Every structure is written in structure tokens, then in C-alpha cells.
DNA sequence: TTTTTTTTTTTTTTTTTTTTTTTTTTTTTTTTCCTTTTTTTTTTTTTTTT
């Protein structure tokens, strides 16, 4: 255990694999809006 | 000389086919491309002639 130093009772499976980072970060996906631009036709909020 | 009996002519439905019309999960993120075009008429320009 990292916090206490105690042994883990169940033995665990460790080893090297090959992992891939994907392009879907959260900085390209986080979005928030309070008040902003509206459409010129229906005066509803925009897209995207 | 009138009654029944056959024929005709609409009359309403039936049934099948054809046509028409309307529909097709929710949300989100990036690029790319286009947002004219050839044809015809009009106007200006340039060269030539007397």
C-alpha cells in the first residue's frame, strides 16, 4: 500500500504493455456558456 | 281488353389495382468548398476615307 505501507492481501498482476494516447483530450471538449451570441433568424443560441 | 312475364336500365356495392404520400434515434467535435457563367446586347475605341 502506498499510503500505509501494508502488504496487499491479494497478489496483483503487473507488467509492461503498449498503450496509445488518443486525440480526444478534455481541453478540446470542455464547454460552458452563460450568455453570448444568438442566431440572426430565431434569436436562439449558436452551434458548437 | 287486362295481367303476367321477359327484357332493359340504372344502382349500389365489391374487389382488385394503381397512385400518392409520408416517414425513417439523441447529442457532440473537427475540416474543406462554394457563396456563377457563358450569351447576348450595348457602348466605347480605333482605323480608314474624302
UniProtKB/Swiss-Prot annotation:
Transmembrane regions: none
Compartments, as annotated in UniProt: Nucleus
Family assignment from sequence similarity: Belongs to the RNA polymerase beta chain family.
Description of how the protein assembles with itself and partners: Component of the RNA polymerase II (Pol II) complex consisting of 12 subunits.
Comment field (misc): The binding of ribonucleoside triphosphate to the RNA polymerase II transcribing complex probably involves a two-step mechanism. The initial binding seems to occur at the entry (E) site and involves a magnesium ion coordinated by three conserved aspartate residues of the two largest RNA Pol II subunits.
Function recorded in the entry: DNA-dependent RNA polymerase catalyzes the transcription of DNA into RNA using the four ribonucleoside triphosphates as substrates. Second largest component of RNA polymerase II which synthesizes mRNA precursors and many functional non-coding RNAs. Proposed to contribute to the polymerase catalytic activity and forms the polymerase active center together with the largest subunit. Pol II is the central component of the basal RNA polymerase II transcription machinery. It is composed of mobile elements that move relative to each other.
Designated name of the protein: DNA-directed RNA polymerase II subunit RPB2
Protein species of origin: Drosophila melanogaster (Fruit fly)
Organism lineage string: Eukaryota, Metazoa, Ecdysozoa, Arthropoda, Hexapoda
Protein's gene: Polr2B
Amino acid at each position: 500500500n502506498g499510503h500505509t505501507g501494508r502488504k496487499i492481501n491479494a497478489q496483483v498482476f503487473l507488467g509492461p504493455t503498449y498503450y496509445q494516447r488518443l486525440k480526444h483530450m478534455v481541453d478540446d471538449k470542455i464547454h460552458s456558456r452563460a450568455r453570448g451570441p444568438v442566431q440572426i433568424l430565431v434569436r436562439q443560441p449558436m452551434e458548437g
